[PDB]
Structure formats: structure tokens, C-alpha cells
Design a protein around this ligand. Structure first.
Ligand code: A1BY8
Lengths: 875, 125
């Protein structure tokens, strides 16, 4: 009400500016350091010496040979946005810069860019120059069909919307070199109208061709010195400089309701035209005064309250005195007021001038201080008699007219050659809506999982390097927990990703520095973060001496679950399992080993469910692990499964299988054809692991002669060193007693989708009763069918729960046989220590691409100003 | 395609009536000339004197695209003409009209492919 427009709060911004400035904090540091970004025109752009001429008004030649330029403009990631290279070539670099900067700004707000699909969000942007059109025409290569959407100005906002699936006004306009602030005003009005809820504003200025500079020099618009003398008595004109920046806006009540970071708030803004004057480019002092007053009225804010005004400050000897004259009419009424312009250190951006001025004002509000104005020493003589409290801070100066009782307020202004003028009022953001100082407490001293992602391996290396640099620069200014929270939840996860686990900031610095130069062929995630992983309850065979010692000594949930299961083991199976877990000799004996792996796997699953909260998208069980799988699958009770595993361990020991196991790489159908060729039905296939790996069970002599024959057949076949047989007509004496004794179990409907490997169709959810266990010890297990069903059902991420990987290669082959990419992981490696615990293994789940709750690991945390991932920059 | 709808005259423009030098008039975008002329014609059709609107808060919006005149001048190589700054930049499309009529409301030009023809009306509303 007091502001006729609904106040709008800026919740994030992005920018790519000359002198290597790609982050608002980098701009702030450069401004405080008093650095310059104007340089000589790079030769690869064009020959500056060819077109340079110090003589004014010489046709075909320019008066300036300098300018602010990016490190590169051709750099762009077509792969990340799914753009064809052929198409990406025809794209105006302005569009690419807009897209990249907008994506950076969205992430700078902590929001997931992908999360905004279908959302009622608008976008407004300004395009001024079409240098790429000039280059394409002079090259005569615009016959490419991809030029139509790659050169048309309107596509820019449309391209952003189509990339992000936004549903809200998309605008590509121009207001000469005032487009950015005009876009800000348009977005503010649109949010006030309620047509949208999130809006993006900004503009990009790309310098690529010289003819425009020559034409500008012909008008005398360019400074011969090569630096903008904004408000200085030596005002020589502006300097063309590259630039692109974007700002995200949300309604202030909505921002407060969502608690999103509020960099600042804009109370109001207005716009008008100078009208009739001498030429099309003569500013009107009265018009500027009128727009100031109109903006103030719209914001309902008194002028003397505002301390610092972000003027245009272009450096033109004609324009600057007029602009100074206009401001003194309104601002600087007795109360001292500081004057600032971003052009002094960057030059002029023909589209981003408004946006960069706004961002500089935002930073000034954030630090309550004003940077000095570069190259400035004194005002022009025409302003010597003007009476006002306005002043230009020659150095870094605290906020003028500091007042605790009033929020700090900043006025911004932008003007274009077209004559349209935009002015806006920016107010300091309110106090922290969240708990003060984020409610500090007993921060966990256990190492934190610091996530990380990027677009490519080398890009990931560079991102890690710069992030380590930044953390080193702020190892004390921030907190580890907040940084971890920001990385996990306040940042989009690019396909190429990894993580570093650390407990203290110097440790994290060292870890990041390790990878910053250390080489490793990282690969993009296979999963899309839409489904949880699939546990692999692998069977016996991978046990080793004292597997659980580290886990007991580091995972409280693991030890608690082990102690929970331990008395049931000593009751049903008749012996303690903790001693075998801590045994310094590898556990042997079908009675002794069988409950041990069950307990290990169920404890690991419980740890993942509680200490890390990762839910399984599906569950895969191997041999006796199938019951352990049903434990977490929600189909079997813990006590019932413990009774099952202990009773089967006891019962199989009666005859110790009475047979042997033979594994052959021959295909299962080919194996069946070979076996039937000799009438050796006394053996039968026991495991269906992969189309290139099968396991056959039978009596010892026949298995031995079969594997000898296959070796004579020039095909690998091994009689494994297992003590007992499985799924063979040799464990038959125990089957009846097993079925009779184990019928007391009470299975139920699984809580997690489960693939019955023993059953013919893993997709069907089994009853997993005593008969199912009789089959699991007597009928063939189709692990190949299970993994094939899981892949067909879209699941891609799999992780072995075994103490050592056993079938990761096998499932890789199954996926390779299906030709679909997959990720297979191992819970633990043979004699592999892990002081960090399963947390390190958790990183691999993230790297694969499975879904999980990050808040489960990071319930709360204040977002911070950690840097952003780099990009692939193929020219 | 070999056909289409085409104006009776495109290069035709009454630069003298609006006080425009032939040089800038030769270099100004014909689209801008057409917009200015038809805007004056619409103003008169409303029954209002265009001179009367001088010094008023009226605003202007316009949709522009297909900067083919840039292609033409690039092919001719006469980009060195200083009038190109205000003769080919899309910004002056609204700005030239505002300055000629002496209006004070916001002047803005935009591009939304083939939807500018009505999105301008929405923005004015
Ligand atoms: C920013 C606008 C300046 C940068 C725009 C560059 C235009 C290039 C167009 C290229 C098109 C074709 C490309 C391929 C060939 C800005 O702030 N504008 C305002 C600058 N200050 C103004 O208020 C006035 C600036 N100039 C002046 O002070 C006068 O207009 C002068 C004296 C230079 C013009 O002479 P006369 O009309 O007084």
C-alpha cells in the first residue's frame, strides 16, 4: 500500500563480465581492490591497429582501440543444454551468455533449475547489438537453416523458457543501453499484476565486430583515452565493453514465506521518456527529475532517506553534467549522499549497464560500504556552483548518513540513446527470517559429506581447484555444516559429480587440492536421481577375517544391529555371531558362515536406512541373501528371517551339500545343450548369473569330469572351492526336513519392490515362504533374469552388499548384453579399511545417480556464497 | 516460394515533413519509417492533432524484427555511415516516434516473433 507496487525482493543474480569476473563476489572483490577491466582489443577479435585512428570523425576508422572483454565469448556448453554442435555454432553468443548466466543466477538462489518445470515463471531480457548477424552476413554463410532460431532476437527468452519449461511471459526487447533496468521494472510490474511468480531480468552486450565501433566514433560517442571519466572533469565519453548479467525476482511476501535468501528488496521503480529535444540523443534534466519523483512516489519512500545513488555515469562531457544537475534537484538535500557508477572500473555495457549497476548497488547494500570511483579526481567546472550534499567517494567509504532505525536504501538509474529513462529504489533486505545466526549448537565433529558436481572431468578438476581456493580464502568466515548443506541442497547436481568427506575446513581444503591436480577419469552419473538404488544381497564366498571391526568401531547403528541380532543367533543357531564377526580367521563352515553374511548385510542395510536414510528403489537378493533381502523388503519379519537363516545353516551342515559346484562361462542355453548331449542330468544348472556366466550343481565326481571336459573343450570352467552344493539333486535329504521345520514363518506383503531371483519371474512379488526357501536351496536362481527385469523396469543403479564384490562384472555383462549403461558398486572390498565409514560408499551412490533425501543428512543449514561449477568452453 | 504480399512503396518516406535529413533518411530502417508514418496516420484517424499530444505522458510500444536492412547495408559495406547508430539500432524505433511527437510516457520496442502484434497491445493495457 505505502508502495503502490508490491515490493519485489532479489533472491539471486548471475554475471559474466570482463577481467575474469564470473561471480558477484568476484566483482565485489575487484571493486574493493579498485581494479580495471578495460584492456586493448584482443587481436583474435579483430586488428585494433587496423581500424584505430586518433583523428576525430575520420570515416572508416575508430577513435578507440580498447575495451572490456571476457576471457572468452565462444565458450559454451552445448552438451549440458542438449544443443547440437552444428546448431550451437549458429547461435548468437549473446543467447548463450544469457542462458548460462541465467542458469548461474538460478543456482545462485539455491533453487534447482530443473525444479521450475511448468512453473508460472516469466522472463524478460534485453538485446541491443547483432554483431553475430553482421559476421554471418559478411561470411555469406547464413544459408544454414539453423540460423533462423539462432539469430532471431525473440528466440532468446523463448530459448530460456523452452530449456527450463517455464510457463510465463518471455520477452526480448531493447531500450538502447537501458534495457536491463527496464526489464527489472517490467518484471516488477508483472509480479505485481500476478501474471507470474518468478521473473528473470537482464541483458547481454557482446562486442565482436569493428564497424559498429567505427560508426560510434564517427558520432564522437567514444572516449579517445580508453577509460570512462564518469563525472570527472576530463569526461571524454564511454568505452564499449562486453557484458552479461541476470537477476531473479520474487514477490517479497512470497520470499519471506519460503524463507529464500533475500539479497535485497526493491520498493518501486518508474519509467518515462524525455520527449522533444534538440536531437534523438539529448537528455532532458526535467524528465530525469520527473522520473526520479515518480519512482519515489511509486515506492512511497522519501528521497533524503536514500544514501547512495547508482547513477548512469557514462563519462560523456555533455551527458554527465546534465545527469549531475538532475540528481542534485532531488537527492543530496542537505544530507550527504554518495555517488557511484559501475562503469569506472568496467566500462560501459550497451545492454547490461542497468543490471551491473543494480548488482553493484546490491553488493554495496550487502557490505554497507561504497567503492571508490576509478579515474575520478574532480567535477567539471559547470558543476562548481551547484549546491547539494552529493559527493563522490574517492576511497572506500562507509555508508553515508548511517542510521540504525532505517534500512539502507539505494537509488539506481539508467538511460539509453533512445531517450527512455528507468529509475528504481532498492532497500536493504530485512533481518534474517530464519533463526538468528542459524541457531548454533553442537555441530557434528564427524566428517561431513561435501558434495560436488560439474559438466566434465577436466571441468570438475577446475571447479574443485577454484572451490578449494575460495574455501582457503574463507576457512574461518564460514562454517562447515552450512557449506555442506548448501552443496547438498542449495545447488543443482550436474551429471559429472563426486564428493569429498571431511570434518574440518583445512582437511576439506587439502582433499579438494588433492583432486585439483590429481588425475582421475571421472564419468557422468548414469541414474537421473529419480529412483533409489537396488541392494544386492550377495551370498557367501566373499568373507574375510574380521570384516566388521571397522564398522563396529565407527557405525553406532551397525553395532546396535549386530548386538540386536547376536542373541538370536546364539539361540537359534546355537553360537554367537559377534565372535565370528571379530574372528581373526576367515569364517568357515556352512553352519557358521550362513548367519554371518545375513547379519552383515542386514546391518549394512539398516545403517543405510538410518544413518544415511537412503531408500532402495528395488531389492535384489542372492542365494541365502534372498531372505536377508526380504528383511528390508518388508516381506519377512526380522525374527522369522533369523530363524530361517539359523535353521538352514544348521540343517545344510547335516550332509554338507553332498555335492560340488561347477561354474562355466558358457551361455545357459548352450550349457543345457551341452549337458543334455551326455545325459548328465544328475547335474543341473544352479545359478543363472549372466548370458556369459552360469553355475552348475551336482555330485563331486560328475562336476569334476564335466569341468575337465570343458577345459578340453577350450572353454573356461572352474569347480569352485565352496564346501557345499546348492540347487542340485544332492541336498535332497535335507529338503523335506527343511520344509517341515521352517513352515512356522509368517511372511507378508513386501514394503519395497522385490525381484524373486529363485522364481521364474522376478517381477512377480513372491510369497517367500518355506517352499520358496526349499526352491532357493534346490531350484535354479535366475540372477540374470532379476537384473534384466530391474534394467527393463528402468533401474540403473546397483550396489553389492557383499563384503567383497562378486557379481559386479556379471551384472555389467548383463547390462552390456542388453547394451544399456549401468552402474554396479560394492559395499565393501576385501580387507579395505574405511575410517570415514559407509559415508564414503554413500558418495558412490550419489555419483551413480540414484535418488535419496539429502535433508536426511542435512536437516538444516544456512545457505552460503560458495562458488559455482565451471563449464566446458569449446569455442 | 516466389510470392507474397508486398507494399506499393517501401523506400518512400516523407523525411521533409518530419524534419529529417536525406542522409539519415537514406540510412534509417524502412521499418522505422513505416512505423512512424502509420503511427501519425493512426493518431490523425483518432481525430487528435498530433501536435496536441506534445508534452504529454503518453507511452508507445512497438514490435520489430527481421532487421534485413542490416543485411543490406552490410552487403553494401556502407556501415561506416554515422547515421547508422540511430538509423539501424532497434531502440530508436520507439524513441524516434517519442522525440518527434514530444511524448513523455515510456517508449519501448521489443520482439516476440509473430506475436508482437498483440503482445504490444497487452503491454499497453
Ligand atoms: C549508452 C548508449 C551508447 C552505446 C550504444 C552504441 C550504439 C551502436 C549502434 C550500432 C548499430 C549498427 C551495428 C553494426 C554497424 C548511453 O548511455 N547512451 C547515452 C549516452 N549519453 C547520452 O545521453 C548522449 C550520448 N552522446 C552524446 O552525449 C550526444 O548524443 C553526442 C554529442 C555524442 C551526439 O551528438 P549530438 O546529437 O549532441
Amino acid at each position: 500500500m505505502e508502495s503502490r507496487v508490491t515490493p519485489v525482493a532479489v533472491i539471486g543474480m548471475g554475471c559474466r563480465l570482463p577481467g575474469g569476473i564470473n561471480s558477484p563476489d568476484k566483482l565485489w572483490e575487484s571493486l574493493l581492490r579498485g581494479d580495471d577491466l578495460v584492456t586493448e582489443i584482443p587481436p583474435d577479435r579483430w586488428d585494433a591497429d587496423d581500424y584505430y585512428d586518433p583523428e576525430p570523425g575520420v570515416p572508416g576508422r575508430s577513435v578507440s582501440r580498447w575495451g572490456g572483454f571476457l576471457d572468452d565469448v565462444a565458450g559454451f556448453d552445448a552438451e549440458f543444454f542438449g544443443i547440437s554442435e552444428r546448431e550451437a555454432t549458429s547461435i548468437d553468443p549473446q543467447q548463450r551468455l544469457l542462458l548460462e548466466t541465467s542458469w548461474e543466477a538460478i543456482e545462485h538462489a539455491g533453487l534447482d533449475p530443473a525444479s521450475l518445470a511448468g512453473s508460472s515463471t516469466a522472463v524478460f531480457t534485453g538485446l541491443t547489438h547483432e554483431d553475430y548477424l553482421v559476421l554471418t552476413t559478411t561470411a555469406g554463410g547464413l544459408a544454414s537453416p539453423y540460423v533462423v532460431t539462432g539469430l532471431n532476437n525473440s528466440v532468446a527468452s523463448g530459448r530460456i523458457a523452452h530449456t527450463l519449461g517455464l510457463h510465463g511471459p518471455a520477452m526480448t526487447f531493447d531500450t538502447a543501453c537501458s534495457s536491463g533496468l527496464m526489464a527489472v521494472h517490467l518484471a516488477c510490474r508483472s509480479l505485481h499484476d500476478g501474471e507470474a511468480d518468478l521473473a528473470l531480468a537482464g541483458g547481454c552486450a557482446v562486442l565482436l565486430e569493428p564497424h559498429a565501433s567505427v560508426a560510434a566514433s564517427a558520432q564522437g560517442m567514444l572516449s579517445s583515452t580508453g577509460r570512462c571519466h564518469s563525472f570527472d572533469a576530463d569526461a571524454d565519453g564511454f568505452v564499449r565493453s562486453e557484458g552479461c548479467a541476470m537477476v531473479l525476482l520474487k514477490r517479497l511476501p512470497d520470499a519471506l514465506r519460503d524463507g529464500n535468501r533475500i539479497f535485497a528488496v526493491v520498493r518501486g521503480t518508474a519509467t518515462n521518456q524525455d520527449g522533444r529535444t534538440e536531437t534523438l540523443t539529448m537528455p532532458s534534466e526535467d524528465a530525469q527529475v520527473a522520473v526520479y519523483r515518480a519512482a519515489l512516489a511509486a515506492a512511497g519512500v522519501q528521497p533524503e532517506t536514500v544514501g547512495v545513488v547508482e547513477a548512469h555515469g557514462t563519462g560523456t562531457p555533455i551527458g554527465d553534467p546534465i545527469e549531475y544537475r538532475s540528481l542534485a534537484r532531488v537527492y543530496g538535500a542537505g544530507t550527504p549522499c554518495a555517488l557511484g557508477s559501475a562503469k569506472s572500473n568496467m566500462g560501459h555495457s550497451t545492454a547490461s549497464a542497468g543490471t551491473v549497476g543494480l548488482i553493484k548497488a546490491i553488493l554495496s547494500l550487502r557490505h554497507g560500504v561504497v567503492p571508490p570511483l576509478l579515474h575520478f579526481n574532480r567535477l567539471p567546472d559547470e558543476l562548481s556552483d551547484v549546491e547539494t550534499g552529493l559527493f563522490v567517494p574517492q576511497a572506500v567509504t562507509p555508508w553515508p548518513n548511517g542510521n540504525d532505525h532505517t534500512p539502507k536504501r539505494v537509488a539506481v538509474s539508467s538511460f539509453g540513446m533512445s531517450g527512455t529513462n528507468v529509475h528504481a529504489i532498492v532497500e536493504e533486505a530485512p533481518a534474517e527470517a530464519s533463526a538468528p545466526e542459524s541457531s548454533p549448537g553442537d555441530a557434528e565433529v564427524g566428517p561431513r559429506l561435501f558434495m560436488l558436481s560439474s559438466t566434465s572431468s577436466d571441468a570438475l578438476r577446475q571447479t574443485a581447484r577454484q572451490l578449494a581456493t575460495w574455501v582457503e580464502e574463507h576457512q574461518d568466515c564460514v562454517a562447515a555444516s552450512d557449506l555442506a548443506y548448501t552443496l547438498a541442497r542449495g545447488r543443482a547436481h550436474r551429471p559429472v559429480r563426486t564428493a569429498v568427506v571431511a570434518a574440518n575446513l583445512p582437511e576439506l581444503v587439502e582433499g579438494l587440492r588433492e583432486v585439483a591436480d590429481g588425475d582421475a577419469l571421472y564419468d557422468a552419473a548414469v541414474g537421473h536421481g529419480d529412483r533409489g538404488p537396488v541392494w544386492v544381497f550377495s551370498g557367501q564366498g566373499s568373507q574375510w577375517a574380521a570384516m566388521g571391526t571397522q564398522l563396529l568401531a565407527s557405525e553406532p547403528v551397525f553395532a546396535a544391529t549386530i548386538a540386536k541380532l547376536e542373541p538370536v543367533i546364539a539361540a537359534e543357531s546355537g553360537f554367537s555371531v559377534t565372535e565370528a564377526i571379530t574372528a581373526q580367521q576367515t569364517v568357515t563352515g556352512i553352519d557358521k558362515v550362513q548367519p554371518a553374511v545375513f547379519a552383515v548385510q542386514v546391518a549394512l542395510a539398516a545403517t543405510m536406512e538410518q544413518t544415511y536414510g537412503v531408500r532402495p528403489g528395488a531389492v535384489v537378493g542372492h542365494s541365502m541373501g534372498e531372505s536377508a533381502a526380504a528383511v528390508v523388503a518388508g516381506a519377512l519379519s526380522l525374527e522369522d528371517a533369523a530363524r530361517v537363516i539359523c535353521r538352514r545353516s544348521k540343517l545344510m551342515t547335516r550332509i554338507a551339500g553332498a555335492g560340488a559346484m561347477g561354474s562355466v562361462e558358457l551361455p545357459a542355453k548352450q550349457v543345457n545343450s551341452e549337458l543334455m548331449a551326455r545325459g548328465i542330468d544328475d547335474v543341473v544348472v544352479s545359478v543363472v548369473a549372466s548370458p556369459q556366466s552360469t553355475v552348475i550343481g551336482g555330485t563331486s565326481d560328475t562336476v569334476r569330469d564335466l569341468i575337465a571336459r570343458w577345459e578340453q573343450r577350450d572353454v573356461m570352467a572352474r569347480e569352485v572351492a565352496v564346501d557345499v552344493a546348492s540347487h542340485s539333486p544332492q541336498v535332497d535329504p535335507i529338503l523335506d526336513d527343511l520344509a517341515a521345520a521352517l513352515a512356522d514363518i509368517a511372511p507378508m506383503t513386501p514394503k519395497v519392490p522385490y525381484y524373486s531371483a529363485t522364481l521364474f519371474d522376478p517381477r512377480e512379488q513372491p510369497v517367500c515362504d518355506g517352499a520358496y526357501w526349499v526352491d532357493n536351496l534346490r531350484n535354479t536362481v535366475q540372477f540374470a533374469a532379476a537384473v534384466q527385469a530391474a534394467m527393463e523396469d528402468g533401474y540403473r543403479v546397483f550396489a553389492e552388499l557383499s563384503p567383497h564384490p562378486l557379481l559386479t562384472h556379471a551384472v555389467e555383462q548383463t547390462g552390456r548384453s542388453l547394451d544399456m549403461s549401468v552402474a554396479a558398486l560394492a559395499g565393501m572390498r576385501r580387507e579395505q579399511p574405511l575410517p570415514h565409514g559407509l559415508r564414503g560408499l554413500l558418495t558412490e551412490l550419489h555419483r551413480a545417480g540414484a535418488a535419496l533425501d539429502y535433508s536426511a543428512l542435512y536437516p538444516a543449514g544456512r545457505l552460503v556464497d560458495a562458488p559455482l561449477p565451471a563449464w566446458t568452453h569449446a569455442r
